[PDB]
């Protein structure tokens, strides 16, 4: 007997069109076999991926809510498209309200009042604070439940409530973060906070090993380790610690920090700072040097951090390591080791491991673009030699706040090595050697050979010549030095060069430079102790080339001056950011942690963005470059504040420099709107070749509230007054093109995109194709009998899918196969099929067809009731 089952595989998609054709699917009971390209982007809006509250609930957990009373149909969300009242489209929202946006946007309001008092418009003031109160009766009438003592987001009924609500309060879907966001913001009554902090407290819900994650543990879609519904955000436990603290309650705020700084996971050892943490355990997770992370640390360092010069603070952050491929990445395709970037400078330095790397600073990590890729392990490594035997050394490297150090000690030469940043394109190496006899010194380098690696271990064979043959890296001697030229590399996902880029040496002493290939050396003779200075620059353009090089001559006739403009600099920035006279050694040092991280992520101008910027992460696979979120900015903006509020400003400024005015080219229904990423590269649609710029979607608004705490710090009338139009714009942008309902009260949505409608306007969605599978038996006839499928997802049971049975061909179905799936026989051909319509995800599974010869007396469903099997055939459905 052999059963032998075929038509498996990578399921095919179909694009569809029309908001009427959608609601016809989701009329006919099949929202799941959808995915709506504008919708995805709402989520991307909303700023949490797959938060519960969006509908986002695997197929354990969902089985789980239904046996525990729940209906399925309870996750779906609805969406809609947003037209002026002359008809044009605007863009889509969800068919929901939240609660986080709209206390957001009484936060805006309640800024924006504060500005035009500043300003002395008093009668803006009172427009803004009649719709800040107005947004707070909708967030405390609408949005607060009386059972659950909680705030959740709404859905839009198809009518209003009796009150007035769009609808109820979406309390099945269980409580996550966006229910402190009316306390965080201020929204909140008094007697409803109370309520909502004592949930926050409670250890069934938030108060976990690391307090206040994603989702409630009570939620029914919570998993520790899902980022969005259940994993520990310092974002959003900052906000619950302020929003407690904003109602009377900073004693057990103060607590929870304590809690927070004993149990998050590495927060007092050397490694990066990451995005998230696991509630239980306070396990890592995520991009290394991530931004709105430091952030909000140090906001915790300054507001809740207590007990209970650059020199004191020694490599806070391990910055040592010998890369061996481009793209030497972790699990989640980030770079693996923390390269020291300063002055918004478009290359970084590590520490040599050991006497392997000794001499140097391996690693050239170099932006290229939007991209992290190291060029070298080696490069301009100094070994020095007495009659031709090598010098000994005792290595000792470390970092400190703005620089990194390295002293190499043998018994009759010495060397020190300082390396600092000097210009936004070109660091600056101090080499001082001591001996009372003369040296031979060597300098060498290799360009790195292979391409990727995940986890230290090699994804491919490829090699980065071979991968990209545009990009023509070439060594050659120069005048003073050597550089190392680019070819032009249009690879819109990995590496990017305009063809003019170059990587130029320059020394203050003359060396005599052989190139070998990928390979160069250079040698020089001295006859006793010398300094000698040396610049790396990184530069993108043939514009920079040429400005650079004035620079280059610069820096080395003044060295002194740049080493100390660094050093001072950087005095200056733990002046102004240990501010905390309450605060522990091991907090401070989280403090200094979170000032190297931002001021590493901060990138100076290039291409398309004319401001300096602050990205989530200079390390980070999709984070680089020059890349800029609104979100990230707000928050990293606050803190920078504290610290370096000349940067904190320009990348406020950065972000509103691509803001959409009247007559834009692409989207002039658009006016007021901020991109979701603006980066290096232009979009098409813009005349770039760019793939990040990204304009489907924006954030939620915290820019008011951004704008106002580098106010508090500055006090300066002229920031708020350059300002508050721009926020103004935004803040009107909401209300004419995220408000389905007209009510005043945003939803998340998306913008009019060729990723979202036709040239015509008729909305994008994607359908999967029908997927047959068939099951040839060989041997006995099953046509009086039993054949069934059955199906099982990476370690799970075997479970039942169709059955079809006896002479009359009766069928059975699984209920989650009902309406979809369609078993059928031909006994001629001793063949059983199943055509699988409305595939999803959660499908995808080894299907097995199964057959009995047996009598039975009811149709067979269970997987011990079959005798015989196939093999299996993997059928794969993705989002
Ligand atoms: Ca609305």
């Known amino acids: 007997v052999q059963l032998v089952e075929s038509g498996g595989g990578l399921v095919k998609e179909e694009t569809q069109s029309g908001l009427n054709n959608y609601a016809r699917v989701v009329e006919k009971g099949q929202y799941d076999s959808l995915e709506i390209p504008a919708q995805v982007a709402a989520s991307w809006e909303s700023g949490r991926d797959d938060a519960a509250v969006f509908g986002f609930i695997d197929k354990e957990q969902l089985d789980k809510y239904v046996a525990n009373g729940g209906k399925r149909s309870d996750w779906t969300v609805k969406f809609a498209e947003n037209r002026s009242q002359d008809g044009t489209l605007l863009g889509y929202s969800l068919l929901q309200e939240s609660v986080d946006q709209a206390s957001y946007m009484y936060s805006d309001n309640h800024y924006l009042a504060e500005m035009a008092t500043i300003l002395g418009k008093p009668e803006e003031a009172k427009r803004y604070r009649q719709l800040a109160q107005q947004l707070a009766d909708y967030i405390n009438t609408c949005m607060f439940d009386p059972t659950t003592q909680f705030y959740y987001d709404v859905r839009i009924e198809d009518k209003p409530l009796a009150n007035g609500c769009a609808g109820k309060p979406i309390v099945e879907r269980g409580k996550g973060p966006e229910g402190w966001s009316p306390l965080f913001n201020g929204a909140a009554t008094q007697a409803n906070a109370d309520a909502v902090v004592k949930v926050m407290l409670d250890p069934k819900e938030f108060n976990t090993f690391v307090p206040l994650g994603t989702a409630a543990l009570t939620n029914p879609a919570f998993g520790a380790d899902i980022y969005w519904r259940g994993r520990v955000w310092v974002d959003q436990f900052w906000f619950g610690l302020k929003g407690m603290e904003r109602y009377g309650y900073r004693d057990d705020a103060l607590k929870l920090a304590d809690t927070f700084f004993r149990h998050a996971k590495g927060l007092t050892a050397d490694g990066p700072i990451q995005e998230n943490y696991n509630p239980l355990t306070g396990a890592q997770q995520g991009a290394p040097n991530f931004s709105w992370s430091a952030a909000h640390l140090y906001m915790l360092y300054n507001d809740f951090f207590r007990k209970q010069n650059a020199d004191n603070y020694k490599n806070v952050i391990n910055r040592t390591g010998a890369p061996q491929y481009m793209k030497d990445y972790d699990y989640d395709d980030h770079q693996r080791f923390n390269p020291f970037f300063d002055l918004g400078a478009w290359h970084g330095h590590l520490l040599p491991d050991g006497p392997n790397t000794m001499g140097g600073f391996p690693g050239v990590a170099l932006l290229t673009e939007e991209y992290i890729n190291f060029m070298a392990s080696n490069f301009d490594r100094l070994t020095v030699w007495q009659d031709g035997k090598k010098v000994d050394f005792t290595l000792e490297a470390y970092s400190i706040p703005g620089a990194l150090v390295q002293k190499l000690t043998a018994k009759d030469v010495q060397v020190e090595m300082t390396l600092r940043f000097a210009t936004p394109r070109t660091s600056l190496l101090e080499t001082k050697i001591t001996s009372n006899k003369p040296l031979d010194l060597v300098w060498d380098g290799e360009l790195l050979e292979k391409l990727e690696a995940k986890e230290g271990k090699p994804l491919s064979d490829k090699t980065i010549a071979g991968e990209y043959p545009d990009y023509q890296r070439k060594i050659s001697a120069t005048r003073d030095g050597l550089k190392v030229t680019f070819g032009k590399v249009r690879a819109t996902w990995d590496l990017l060069t305009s063809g003019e880029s170059e990587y130029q040496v320059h020394k203050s002493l003359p060396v005599q430079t052989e190139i070998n290939g990928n390979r160069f050396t250079s040698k020089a003779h001295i006859n006793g102790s010398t300094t000698l200075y040396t610049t790396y620059s990184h530069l993108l353009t043939a514009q920079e080339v040429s400005k650079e090089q004035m620079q280059i001559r610069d820096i080395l006739a003044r060295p002194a001056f740049y080493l100390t403009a660094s050093q001072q600099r950087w005095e200056e920035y733990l002046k102004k950011g240990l501010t905390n006279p309450d605060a522990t050694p091991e907090q401070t040092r989280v403090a200094v942690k979170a000032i190297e991280t931002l001021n590493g992520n901060w990138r100076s101008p290039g291409g398309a963005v004319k401001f300096n910027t602050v990205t989530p992460s200079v390390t980070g696979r999709w984070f680089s470059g020059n890349q800029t979120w609104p979100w990230d900015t707000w928050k990293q903006a606050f803190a920078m504040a504290h610290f370096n509020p000349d940067i904190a400003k320009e990348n406020i400024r950065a972000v509103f420099s691509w803001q959409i005015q009247p007559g834009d080219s692409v989207r002039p229904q658009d006016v007021g709107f901020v991109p979701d990423l603006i980066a290096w590269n232009l979009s098409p649609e813009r005349g770039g070749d760019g793939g990040n710029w990204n304009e489907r979607n924006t954030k939620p608004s915290l820019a008011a509230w951004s704008v106002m705490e580098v106010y508090n710090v500055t006090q300066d009338k002229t920031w708020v007054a350059e300002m508050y139009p721009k926020l103004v714009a935004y803040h009107d942008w909401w209300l004419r093109n995220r408000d389905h309902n007209g009510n005043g009260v945003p939803e998340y949505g998306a913008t009019r995109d060729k990723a979202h409608n036709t040239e015509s306007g008729e909305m994008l969605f994607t359908v999967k194709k029908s997927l047959r599978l068939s099951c040839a038996a060989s041997?006995?006839?099953?046509?009086?009998?039993?054949m069934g499928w059955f199906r099982q997802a990476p370690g799970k049971e075997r479970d039942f899918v169709a059955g079809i049975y006896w002479t009359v061909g009766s069928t059975y179905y699984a209920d989650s196969a009902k309406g979809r799936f369609t078993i059928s026989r031909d006994n001629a051909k001793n063949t059983v099929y199943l055509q699988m319509d409305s595939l999803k995800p959660e499908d995808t599974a080894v299907y097995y067809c199964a057959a009995r010869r047996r009598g039975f007396t009811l149709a067979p469903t269970r997987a011990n009731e079959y005798d015989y099997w196939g093999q299996g055939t993997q059928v794969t459905v993705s989002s």
């Open positions: 041997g006995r006839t099953f046509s009086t009998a039993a």
